[PDB]
Structure 1
């Protein structure tokens, strides 16, 4: 008896690993850009924590749309990174 999920999220996690590596490689030399994005994640994790602290009834101030728009405004010139990012919230998925 398992029921504990033996098949976790492998492909999207491995894609994420490569993506974060790709983010570094993409803007290697400019810490502010990568750090700013990291702080975005930091901020969303904070908001998510605070939301679930109230059970989830309380909605955070940082929405997925907000995040994505912030990321797009964050990484300019190279949309290829954002193109990779699109897999972490694909419009094709509802």
Structure 2
């Protein structure tokens, strides 16, 4: 089951894609790129998760953070905010 008290993924992720959508609303290239990174990273994460460990994920935490870091220059706010999402361990 899911929760309802103190929603982190909801408010955070939603406001994330929202702010970025309204920010680079004129640049669909960089926006599509980022989305493509998380997309491929998602599928690689799911598959690798179902595999166990004998699988070799294509994109890792460093792959995404790097490409994303290259996607933007003067806009580091996105990189930091994104880091907040990056699973802590």
Question: How many residues align structurally?
Answer: 89
Deviation at 1:7, TM superposition (A): 5.2
Aligned-residue Cα RMSD (Å) equals: 2.5
> Max radius of gyration: which structure?
1
Gapped regions of structure 1 (runs ≥ 5) = none
TM-score by length of 2: 0.79
2:65/2:79 contact within 8 Å kept: no
| 4+ residue segments displaced more than 2 Å | 4-9, 52-57
TM-score by length of 1: 0.75
Per-residue Cα deviation, 1:20-49 (whole angstroms, up to 9, x for no partner): 111112212000110000100111122123
Among 72, 78, 81, the residue aligned to 1:75: 72
Gapped regions of structure 2 (runs ≥ 5) = none
1:33/1:74 contact within 8 Å kept: yes
